[PDB]
Copies of this chain bind each other. A is one copy, B any other.
């Protein structure tokens, strides 16, 4: 019970740690931090307002506005307030994906996609539930 949660946390830190490493060059080449990168990542799924990003990240709305403002000054993001990636933000995400995809696909090339979709399903239901507790108090 406790070891599962403990495992998930080591798993989360290891994923984040490898990602930070795999993406550091790219981020510096663009002059952005990991948090701005992470917002760029959220926006590649779809355009969002500062409010939705706040909800997703869980932080203070102004810490998000701060990242977004830096992103606009860097022109990696454009307005209408609906935020969406700009052409520069799009190039960034394509390189981020190219990188992340390369490693992931090599790392999972032997996975049985029939077995895996059952795992994805359990994780989608868990994510659903996570977002709901979050939704409330």
Q: Which residues of A contact B (CB under 8 A)?
A: 1-2, 4-18, 20-22, 24, 34, 38, 41-42, 45, 56-59, 97, 100-101, 103-105, 107-108, 111, 115-116, 118-120, 122-124, 126-127, 129-131, 133-134
Contact = CB atoms under 8 A, between A and B. Distances in A.
A98 B136 CA distance: 20
A4 B104 contact: yes
A25 B26 CA distance: 36
A130 B104 contact: no
Q: How many copies does the complex hold?
A: 2
Given A5-B97, A120-B4, A122-B116, A12 B15 contact: yes
Contacts of A111: 122
Contact of A119 (B21, B118, B127): B118
